[PDB]
């Protein structure tokens, strides 16, 4: 679900292309947030692992 | 550092040779880590970076 595959919901369609920098996240650190961040890639299934880490890596 | 070996037929023996300095230097700039930190707070404007992510103005 983290990948909002499932567009049915009204939910995971409400994030349009206008919703795009706020998705960085911390993009200037809340101007309060020094930027120690972790990308707690456990529970996430194997199979799509590398494809989130290329996505991340890359963005 | 400064120092290269020329290899060649120009020469007879390819050696190692200390080169002076070149003045004027060329505008050799590599971004270093540190000092831009603890350098108070950096708010870089968005709205124009987030322009150019989309080659609208490149």
Redesign the interface.
């Given at each position: 679900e983290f990948l909002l595959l499932n567009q049915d919901v009204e939910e995971n369609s409400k994030y349009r292309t206008e919703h795009?920098?706020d998705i960085l996240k911390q993009?200037?650190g809340y101007?309060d947030r020094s930027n120690v961040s972790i990308i707690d890639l456990s529970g996430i299934p194997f199979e799509v692992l590398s494809i989130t880490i290329s996505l991340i890596s890359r963005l | 550092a400064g120092e290269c070996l020329v290899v060649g037929d120009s020469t007879p023996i390819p050696s190692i040779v200390k080169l002076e300095l070149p003045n004027p230097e060329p505008r050799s700039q590599s971004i270093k880590f540190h000092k831009k930190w603890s350098e108070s707070?950096r708010?870089?404007s968005?709205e124009e970076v987030?322009m150019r992510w989309r080659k609208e103005n490149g």
């Open positions: 795009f920098e993009f200037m101007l | 707070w708010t870089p968005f987030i």
